[PDB]
Amino acid sequence: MRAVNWNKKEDDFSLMFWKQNIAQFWTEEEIAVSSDKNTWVQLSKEEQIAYKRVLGGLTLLDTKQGGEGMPLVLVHLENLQAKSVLAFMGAMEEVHAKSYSHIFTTLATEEEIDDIFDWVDNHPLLEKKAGIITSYYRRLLKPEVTKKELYMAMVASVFLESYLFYSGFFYPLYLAGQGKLTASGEIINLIIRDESIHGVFVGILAQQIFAELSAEEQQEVQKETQELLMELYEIEMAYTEEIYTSIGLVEDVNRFVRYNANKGLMNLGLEPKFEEEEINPIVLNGLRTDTKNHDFFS
Amino acid sequence: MRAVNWNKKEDDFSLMFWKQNIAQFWTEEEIAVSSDKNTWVQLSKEEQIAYKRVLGGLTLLDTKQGGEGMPLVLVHLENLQAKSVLAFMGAMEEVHAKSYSHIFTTLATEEEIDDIFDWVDNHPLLEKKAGIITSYYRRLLKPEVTKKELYMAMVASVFLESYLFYSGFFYPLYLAGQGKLTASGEIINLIIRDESIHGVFVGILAQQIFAELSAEEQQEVQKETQELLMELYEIEMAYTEEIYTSIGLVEDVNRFVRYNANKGLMNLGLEPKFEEEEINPIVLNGLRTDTKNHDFFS
Amino acid sequence: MLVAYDSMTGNVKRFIHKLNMPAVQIDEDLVIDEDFILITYTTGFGNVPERVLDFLERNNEKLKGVSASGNRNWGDMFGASADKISTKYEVPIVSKFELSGTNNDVEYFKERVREIAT
Amino acid sequence: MLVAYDSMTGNVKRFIHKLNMPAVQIDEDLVIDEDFILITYTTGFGNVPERVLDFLERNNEKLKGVSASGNRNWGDMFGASADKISTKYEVPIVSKFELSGTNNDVEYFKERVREIAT
Ligand SMILES: Cc1cc2c(cc1C)N(C[C@H](O)[C@H](O)[C@H](O)COP(=O)(O)O)c1[nH]c(=O)[nH]c(=O)c1N2
Numbered sequence A, B: 001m002r003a004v005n006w007n008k009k010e011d012d013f014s015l016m017f018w019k020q021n022i023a024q025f026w027t028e029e030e031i032a033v034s035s036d037k038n039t040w041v042q043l044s045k046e047e048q049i050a051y052k053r054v055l056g057g058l059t060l061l062d063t064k065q066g067g068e069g070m071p072l073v074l075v076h077l078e079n080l081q082a083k084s085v086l087a088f089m090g091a092m093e094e095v096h097a098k099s100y101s102h103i104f105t106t107l108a109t110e111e112e113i114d115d116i117f118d119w120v121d122n123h124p125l126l127e128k129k130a131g132i133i134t135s136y137y138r139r140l141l142k143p144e145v146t147k148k149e150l151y152m153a154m155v156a157s158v159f160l161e162s163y164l165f166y167s168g169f170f171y172p173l174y175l176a177g178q179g180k181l182t183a184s185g186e187i188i189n190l191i192i193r194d195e196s197i198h199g200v201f202v203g204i205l206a207q208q209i210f211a212e213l214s215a216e217e218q219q220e221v222q223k224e225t226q227e228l229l230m231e232l233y234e235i236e237m238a239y240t241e242e243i244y245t246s247i248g249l250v251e252d253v254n255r256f257v258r259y260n261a262n263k264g265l266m267n268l269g270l271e272p273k274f275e276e277e278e279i280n281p282i283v284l285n286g287l288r289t290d291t292k293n294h295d296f297f298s
Numbered sequence C, D: 001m002l003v004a005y006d007s008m009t010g011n012v013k014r015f016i017h018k019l020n021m022p023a024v025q026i027d028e029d030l031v032i033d034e035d036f037i038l039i040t041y042t043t044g045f046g047n048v049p050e051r052v053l054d055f056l057e058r059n060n061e062k063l064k065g066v067s068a069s070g071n072r073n074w075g076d077m078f079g080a081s082a083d084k085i086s087t088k089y090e091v092p093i094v095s096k097f098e099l100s101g102t103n104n105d106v107e108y109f110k111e112r113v114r115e116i117a118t
């Protein structure tokens, strides 16, 4: 049986991504969020509910990625250096999920927090959204998977990392770009920094497997990738309708969803499918934070 | 579907172990090992071969724990906070495995390192040892596992964390306790610090599952746990015979193996099975290093 | 003589049952008003568990000695909860032992306490 | 005018093929002896890839401008490889664009270079 040997490179990418992972290492204790309550009490009730709901939804997605997505993909990889990178990325998904609880502790009481998590667990739309993604992961719970099954699981993972998070990321960035809940916004930006390199890395791995598929299987996964993209898009539009109608931001979020769907496609080496529009300028302001340049190695 | 909620504790232990994990976070770039070559050239040829062979064997075991052991156990856990801890422990297994390559780069040439890894891959004894452990993990590659299958996989994991590593850990500690290869010894001590809390944590989880088994299943896993312990012991004795005969340390290592087997049993809440002897005093000196008190949070 | 102790994963609890001495597990409210020996486990980086620290704030006038369970894997932090309590309250370290202790640990402890109780 | 570029995961390479301009991927040995525009990707924390840095040590006398591909997820580090090259060698930033660029990015680039080439 093979042991991992980092003195002979198995690919051209894993070492650079291993090092970047660790340079980006962070934990929620590094960002105090208590100063956010001064601006949190300035938000209307409808604004507060939307914010708690999107964080609950993000917590669910990170839970599934750390507890199902990364471990079931990595266990079937033969490249031991790439396997190592995914194990660390899976650990950081748990840091992300925990960091949302750090935000909640400040903004809501014990009973408010339980209610939000009850809502997440029983929401039919989140169940369907998460269930579609994890059905690609659960296929891998067997001793032997085909390259086609592994490819589609990586596509599912990139679509989560690069696309499905962003209907939720939109609102903390929108508020932070206006100077509201800026400490929480710093944590969201640290999360986004990680997910940006997660999606690139899994996209690289998917493209290597794609080249090993037969001509007929490439045609099959291409069609299935396009159907999955559009199936998830239909769900995101229903989700943004439910979350953002009360605060008048549905069209803004949908634009941001299509914008990130195009990035997720490009991570897989595929051409964009939605019309090119520029990022919302307030969201763009929320992505500027001094915390994002912190290197662990310094 | 459930999202992880750290504001309501799922057990009495996961939060403390989550925090301890992170406080113990380290990476190989923190310890330069180049000063070790001054004492490495003082070792005989038989001593150098033994050292390279035990490190290759340790690299194999950490590879399997990070790429199979932690991910397949954690995917079947329902406790989402405990799942989080195991994901991080699995990431640290990859840091461990990589750290052995950092040692090799200093002590051996490119061709020497390839030869050692060829030896590891094709060694029938390592294959059988690793194959016994991972056969408990591979049972979990299916959608539904029983509590008995999950318990035996945790037993296998504790036996690896607390017992099977130590026929390999013995020799770096023995040399470092004599002032030889002390920088490498620092890394081995950081690894041991992690494995000590890994074995405790998985042992706690196993004991919780044990209490949920029926009376008949408790009797079954008790017998199977004892047979596995002794089966692994037979293999360790053949392994220490092969590795340490040339340098006259077979009896010393076997004592150290039984000493740690007793600790692994106690981690599972079971009574020791080997006679109580005190630790080798030179190994004990090798376990004293100023690097082990480093807290990430400070 | 009374033994007060704390245990998180059961090792100290098992050591206690080998002693055949009067012993009581500590909680936040507990008040001992007679001489006692404390056995604690070691947590963190050679640290005293917080419940033991809180208990000692109220009960240190009757503390006559301390033992610690630990794991020699921790190097110089082995059983270091005993060192911190010993220097803080100027009481002797009775002994240090690993996990649930060996039979020699038990007999060494009982000999140490008979020595102290004079 | 010649375009020199580097690409790790193909985004800059795809941008290049939209330009319909003479273009060449850089390597360690490459020597350009005519005016060129550099397009680099952004790595690390707003950093220039090392191969681009090495290439510029030998070829900066003919460098007339730089564009960078990046991702606006990086905040103020978006396309910051261009800023570092621009200040290091006193050449203009032609443009910054995301991944493989939009059609507006292409036309903005071609307009910027026609502007520079005078
Ligand atoms: C998180 C954590 C941290 C430490 C430990 C364990 C754990 C889980 N233990 C070992 C511990 O003291 C030993 O297992 C005791 O036997 C625990 O006793 P109970 O089983 O709780 O009575 C430990 N032991 C030691 O000698 N020095 C130390 O610094 C530590 N640190």
Ligand SMILES: Cc1cc2c(cc1C)N(C[C@H](O)[C@H](O)[C@H](O)COP(=O)(O)O)c1[nH]c(=O)[nH]c(=O)c1N2
Pocket (backbone or CB within 6 Å): A020, A197, A200, D006, D007, D008, D009, D010, D011, D012, D013, D041, D042, D043, D044, D045, D046, D047, D069, D070, D071, D072, D074, D077, D078, D079, D080, D098, D099, D100
């Ligand atoms: C490790 C790592 C680090 C960074 C990036 C990516 C990766 C993988 N990228 C994004 C990158 O520049 C973008 O995806 C480019 O399009 C890459 O171009 P090629 O596809 O290599 O031509 C990036 N982008 C940016 O604008 N600022 C940055 O600091 C970084 N840092």
Ligand SMILES: [Mn+2]
Pocket (backbone or CB within 6 Å): A062, A065, A092, A093, A096, A097, A191, A195
């Ligand atoms: Mn995440």
Ligand SMILES: [Mn+2]
Pocket (backbone or CB within 6 Å): A065, A089, A093, A161, A194, A195, A198, A199
């Ligand atoms: Mn991710």
Ligand SMILES: [Mn+2]
Pocket (backbone or CB within 6 Å): B062, B065, B092, B093, B096, B097, B191, B195
């Ligand atoms: Mn390990």
Ligand SMILES: [Mn+2]
Pocket (backbone or CB within 6 Å): B065, B089, B093, B161, B194, B195, B198, B199
């Ligand atoms: Mn371990």
